[PDB]
Design a protein around this nucleic acid. Sequence first.
DNA 1: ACGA
Length: 111
Amino acid sequence: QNWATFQQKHIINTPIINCNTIMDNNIYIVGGQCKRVNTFIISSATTVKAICTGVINMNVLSTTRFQLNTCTRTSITPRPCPYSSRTETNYICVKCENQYPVHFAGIGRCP
DNA sequence: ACGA
C-alpha cells in the first residue's frame, strides 16, 4: 500500500531459512487469518526502490533479476499456519507510485 | 486478490 509497508512485508536482507517462522507475524494476518502468499525479496531497500526511479504511477517489471523466497500457506489453522517455500531468481513486477514500490504485483511478469 |  505504501513504501514503508512494502519494505516491511517484502524486503529482507538475508535468505528465508524457514517460511513457517517468518510468516508468524501479525503483519501477515488479513481478515483475521494467515495470508495466502507472500514473496520475500532478498535485497536492500535501495536496490528494490531503484526499480521505480523516474516512475510516477505504473506497474514496472524490473530490468534485473532478484533472489526471491515465496511462502505459500498450505492450510488455514490457528496461528501460526503452515507454509511451503519456493525459491527462485527472477524479475519482479511492483507498482511504482511517486518512485516508490507500493505493492508486489508479480514474479517474472506484470499482470 | 502478495494494496487500494
